[PDB]
Design a protein around this ligand. Sequence first.
Ligand SMILES: C[C@@H]1N[C@@H](c2cn(-c3ccccc3)nn2)[C@H](O)[C@@H]1O
Length: 445
Amino acid sequence: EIPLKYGATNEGKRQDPAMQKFRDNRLGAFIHWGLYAIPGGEWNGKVYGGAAEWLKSWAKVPADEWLKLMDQWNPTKFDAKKWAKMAKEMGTKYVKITTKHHEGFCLWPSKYTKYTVANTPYKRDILGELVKAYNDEGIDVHFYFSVMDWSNPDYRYDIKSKEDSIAFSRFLEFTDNQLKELATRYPTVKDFWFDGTWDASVKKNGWWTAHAEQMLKELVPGVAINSRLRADDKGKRHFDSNGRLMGDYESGYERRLPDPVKDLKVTQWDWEACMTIPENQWGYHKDWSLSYVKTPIEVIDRIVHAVSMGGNMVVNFGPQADGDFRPEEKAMATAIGKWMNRYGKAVYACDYAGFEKQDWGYYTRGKNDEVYMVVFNQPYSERLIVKTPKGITVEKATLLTTGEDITVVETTRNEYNVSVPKKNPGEPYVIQLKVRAAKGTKSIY
Ligand SMILES: C[C@@H]1N[C@@H](c2cn(-c3ccccc3)nn2)[C@H](O)[C@@H]1O
C-alpha cells in the first residue's frame, strides 16, 4: 500500500440521489460545437481525414489565425428549444456539452478570456440558452471542459523550468476561475467531464486535479466529476497508485467498450462511455464518406451493451456552423428515439444482471429485479439460451411489447431455452423474464 494525499476519495459507488440519477439516466447525447465547425475538416483547399475538431493541429494553424474564425461565428439557425426537442425525441436523459474544447473558444461569455461567444457576431450566451432549453425539457446538462487550451500562452505541455512552473501556475488559476464561473453561472449543472488532461504538466500537478474536484463539489451539491480529470501524487491517471478509481465514475471507454466476458470488473464502479457516429469525428466534418458511418442498430447495440455492464452511453453529435444538425444526425436521433420509446424499459434505470453473456444479445436488470433479454442476433435454432446463476430460476417469459407469454423450457440444471416469439419482431427486441432467487442463495435478487 502507497500513501497518497491526492488519490481516491469515494470508497465504492456513490449512492446519493444525485449519483443515482446520473446512473439511472443511462443514455446521453454529446455535443461538440466550436469554431472547428466552420471549416468542417477543410483548411485552405485541403480536406483533412483526421478529427475535425483537431483541424487546427492537422493543418498546423497558428492560434491567432485559428481564433479569427470567431469573426465568422454566426449560427443563424441555432435554436436551443429545437435542439432540446431533438434530444427529447431521441430519448436522451442528459446532454454533455463542449463548454470549451482544446481550441479554447468558450460557448459562454467568460470574463477570463476574450475568446468567447460574446466577441463574435452572434454575441449570445449559447451555453446558457442550451442549459435553459434542455432543463425545460427535463434533460440534465453536463459540461465538457478541456483543460488543455491552445488559445492561452500560459499553457504548458510539460514543466521543465521554474518559468514553466510560474506560467502553468497562472494557467491553473485561470482554469479554476473558468470552472468556478461555470459552476456559479449555471448551478443546475450535474457533471463536469474533463478532457485534455493527459499532458505531463497535468500529471505533475495531481494536487490540482484533486482540488478542482473538491472545489466543484463544494460549489455544486451532488455534482459528478469524471475520472479523466484526476492524477494522483505519482502522476497516475483515472485510477490512483493503489488501483482505486478517482472521481465519481470511469470515463476512459471512448469509441470502444469493455468486453462482456472478460471485463466484468467494470460492474464494480460507475462508468460512462462515449461514441461517434462515424469512425472518428466529434466536431462537424463536411465529408462523412471518408470513414465508416454507423447504422442506428449498430448504435443501439452499443447503448445496450453499455447498460448491460453497468455503464452509461453518450452518443455524439457535431452540429453545423449554422446551428442546425446535418441530415444523418437527425435520422439517427429519430431512429434511436423510436426504438427507445418501444424498448426503453430495458435501458433506463437498468444495470448489470449478473448472468453469463450469451450470443443472442444482452441482459439488463430493472429496479424491481426484472431481467430483460435484449435480442440482437436471432438464432436459427429458435431458442434463446439462458443460463442462470446459482439459486436463480426463471418463472416466466413475456414479450415486452405485447405481453404475450413465451415458452420457457428447462434443458439442464441452471439452463433454459427461452423460445423466440412466434412472429419475428424484425428488429432488436426485448423478452422480459421473471426470476426467483431461492431461500438461502447468494448474489443480489
Ligand atoms: C471526447 C473526445 N476527446 C478528444 C481527443 C482526445 N485525443 C487525444 C489525442 C492524443 C492523446 C490522447 C488523447 N484526441 N482527441 C476528442 O476531440 C473529443 O473531445
